[PDB]
Design a protein around this ligand. Structure first.
Ligand SMILES: [Ca+2]
Ligand SMILES: [Ca+2]
Ligand SMILES: [Ca+2]
Ligand SMILES: [Cl-]
Ligand SMILES: [Cl-]
Ligand SMILES: [Cl-]
Ligand SMILES: [Cl-]
Ligand SMILES: [Rb+]
Ligand SMILES: [Rb+]
Lengths: 93, 93, 93, 93
């Protein structure tokens, strides 16, 4: 779906921005920055908190701005792709 | 009916099994702790443990994106086909 | 609203059950058990995880069963009470 | 329009201010850390810190119940009146 693609591109770009930020300012390895971006914007959460005042402020802003994006993408991911595939199997061809 | 709900239940169970196996082997958690990690992640509660392997972080990211929509679709249908019915149905003479 | 009251009574009973369980099996002070019940069922999360296998299993079950209840109550709390009061102030009597 | 959205924005800001003041005085957090705690709690991300005073736990429980609906209503309207419009409006010739 076109909208689903827009939401994917936006989500990936958001997670790239978060990865870059947290690997630079917080000194995280990229994978750790990606994990933190993912677990922050999806609201799962992790065992670590940001240590720089700049990191804390950015995380606040990143949450409010990316949370809705990531959950719109999760909704479309579940609805235009995961649940329907299984529901195609409910009819025995 | 409770036919879609059954589908979401089986999908959620298999998802939690996959997470259980994954986190028990790669992260060395006991199976109950792997099931707990799978459950608290996909429900977004989270916990004070975080994966230690780069493989575990990559998998957890993908597991989050794919399984939040299933686990919460299951919770939604559990509320709409089992919880909401039993309450209202009892709010009658 | 009648339904709002049903949801409150259910929510309070749920948090009582969780408080009792976690203070007995996990040895938490009641307030700590109440905090854990609250932060678990609302998905905020805390810095501690359950330590007993029994505690872990119960938390899994408690999440799936109480999560929908607590968020239905949060919705009605925001919608039949908090947001509307403020919206009554939007019209200058 | 963006009139209800403005109301949710001001309510969210005042809620975050209240949390900031509360957690800075009773829990001895720096103000930025109190703002962070308020923000990650009400967005349900959570963090590795937990309140130490019994007063802080009681307040946090009430703050969660009252402010999740506001903070997420604000995120919903931010997505529906600011984020969804700017994307689609740009998905035109
Ligand atoms: Ca949520
Ligand atoms: Ca946490
Ligand atoms: Ca921790
Ligand atoms: Cl890396
Ligand atoms: Cl075992
Ligand atoms: Cl106590
Ligand atoms: Cl300061
Ligand atoms: Rb959460
Ligand atoms: Rb969380």
């Amino acid at each position: 779906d076109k909208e689903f693609q827009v939401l994917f591109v936006l989500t990936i770009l958001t997670l790239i921005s978060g990865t870059i930020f947290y690997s630079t300012v917080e000194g995280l390895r990229p994978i750790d920055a990606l994990y933190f971006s993912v677990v922050t914007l999806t609201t799962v959460g992790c065992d670590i908190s940001p240590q720089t005042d700049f990191g804390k402020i950015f995380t606040i802003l990143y949450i409010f701005i990316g949370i809705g994006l990531v959950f719109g993408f999760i909704h479309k991911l579940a609805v235009n792709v995961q649940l329907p595939s299984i529901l195609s199997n409910l009819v025995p061809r």
